[PDB]
Structures are given as C-alpha cells and as structure tokens.
Amino acid sequence: GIVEQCCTSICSLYQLENYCN
C-alpha cells in the first residue's frame, strides 16, 4: 500500500501526492 510501500521502501512524494486531490 502507501504505508507499507514507503515505510519499508524509500519512496518519494509521487505516490504521496497521488492520494491527495
């Protein structure tokens, strides 16, 4: 998900600003 795909993987703000409007 977005918490498991970023809590264990150094993701960027890409998937983060995808859940936002």
In the complex, minimum distance from the CB of residue 14 to another protein, in angstroms, rounded to a whole number: 10
Would you say 2 and 15 are in contact if contact means Cβ atoms under 8 Å apart? yes
- How far is 1 from 3, CA to CA, in rounded Å? 6
- Taking the complex as a whole, the smallest distance from the CB of residue 8 to another protein amounts, in Å, to 8
Yes or no: say if 19 and 2 are a contact pair by the CB < 8 Å rule. yes
Q: Which residues bind another protein (CB under 8 A)?
A: 2-3, 6-11, 13, 16-17, 19-21
State the minimum distance, in angstroms, from the CB of residue 11 to another protein: 8
